[PDB]
Amino acid sequence: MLTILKLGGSILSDKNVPYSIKWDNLERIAMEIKNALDYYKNQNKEIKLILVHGGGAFGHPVAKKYLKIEDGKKIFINMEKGFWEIQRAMRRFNNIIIDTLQSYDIPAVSIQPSSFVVFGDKLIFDTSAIKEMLKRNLVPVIHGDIVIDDKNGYRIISGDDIVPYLANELKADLILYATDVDGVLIDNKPIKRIDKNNIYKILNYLSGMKYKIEMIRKNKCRGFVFNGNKANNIYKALLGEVEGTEIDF
C-alpha cells in the first residue's frame, strides 16, 4: 500500500550551481512516477505514495550563508534573517517540483517542515495531516528544510531524517532512495544486499551513505538504494524492483 520515494540530491539539481534545476531529468522523473501510478490503477491496486526531495542547489547554498565555523562547531547566525531566507529557497524548489508533478496530473501537495517540525532530543513531527492526505490519495511532497531545535536552536532536517522516520511512523510497505550511484558502492561496486551479517564489516568500511544506512536500521526498516539518472529505474523501482543495493532491518 504505502511507499516512500526519495529524490535525492543531484538528480534534480546540480549542487555546484546555486539555484540550478535539472529540468529534463525532473520532467522525466515526474513522468515515470505517473506511468507507475497508472500501471497500478489498472491492476486496481490501492497504492499510497509519499515523496521526499533534498535541498539540492537551493537549501544548501543559501544556508551556507548563515553557517559559521567556530571551535569545530557548525553555527547558525543572523537567523533573524536566516530562517526566512532558507525557508524561501526551499519553497522555490518545492513549488518547482510540485508544479511539475502536478502537470503530469500527480496530486502532489506541499509539506513544509520548518513550520511545525522540531529537532533535538526526540523528533517532534505530527504526521496527523499526512495520514489524512494519504486517505485522499493525495501525494504529499516533503523537503529538507530549516527547523527549530529545542536544544541546539537551529538545525537542518534532511530527507535521511525524514524518510526513515515516516516509514516507521506510517508503517511504510516499501521505501526507495533515488540517487546518482548504482547503489551503495563498496570498493567501487554496488553490493546487492545489506543485512545483519556483512553490516559490521560495512560500518567499519564507511567509518551520509552511512548516516542513511544507520537511520534505516535504527528502525528495522528496509529500503532500496538505486540510480535515479537511469531512464526507467524510478518506474521500475516503484513497480516492484530494479538493480540497486538492498538494506533490510
Ligand X SMILES: C=C(C)CCOP(=O)(O)O
Binding residues for substrate: 55, 60, 159
- Binding residues among 159-178 for ligand X as defined by CB under 6 A: 159-160
Query: How far apart are the C-alpha atoms of 142 and 109, rounded to whole Å?
Result: 9
> Binding to ligand X by residue 223, rule CB under 6 A?
no
Number of residues that bind ligand X (CB under 6 A): 15
> Binding to its own copies by residue 100, rule CB under 8 A?
no
Query: How far apart are the C-alpha atoms of 223 and 238, rounded to whole Å?
Result: 12
C-alpha cell at 202: 560495512
The candidate with the shortest Cα–Cα distance to 166, out of 191, 133, 203, is: 133
Q: Smallest distance, Å, CB 83 to its own copies?
A: 5
> Binding to its own copies by residue 108, rule CB under 8 A?
yes
Inter-helix orientation angle 209-217/159-169, to 10°: 10
The candidate with the shortest Cα–Cα distance to 84, out of 63, 105, 102, is: 63
Of residues 80, 188, 204, 240, which one binds its own copies by CB under 8 A? Answer: 80
Of residues 55, 82, 164, 223, which one binds ligand X by CB under 6 A? Answer: 55
> Binding to its own copies by residue 133, rule CB under 8 A?
yes
Query: How far apart are the C-alpha atoms of 221 and 225, rounded to whole Å?
Result: 13
Number of residues that bind its own copies (CB under 8 A): 41
Residue whose CB is less far from its own copies, 152 or 232? 152
End-to-end CA distance of the chain: 19
> Binding to its own copies by residue 95, rule CB under 8 A?
yes
Of residues 16, 42, 44, 115, which one binds its own copies by CB under 8 A? Answer: 115
Tallying the residues shown for the chain, one arrives at 249
Of residues 111, 157, 174, 215, which one binds its own copies by CB under 8 A? Answer: 111
Phi-psi region of 80 (alpha: psi -120 to 50; beta: other; left: phi over 0): alpha
Q: What are phi and psi of 222, to 5 degrees?
A: 180, 110
- Reduced to 3 states (helix: H, G, I; strand: E, B; else coil), residue 226 is strand
Residues within the interface to ligand X (CB under 6 A): 9, 54-55, 59-60, 63, 86, 90, 144-146, 156, 158-160
Residues within the interface to its own copies (CB under 8 A): 79-81, 83-84, 87-88, 91, 95, 98-99, 102, 105, 107-118, 124, 126, 128-129, 132-133, 135-138, 147-150, 152-153
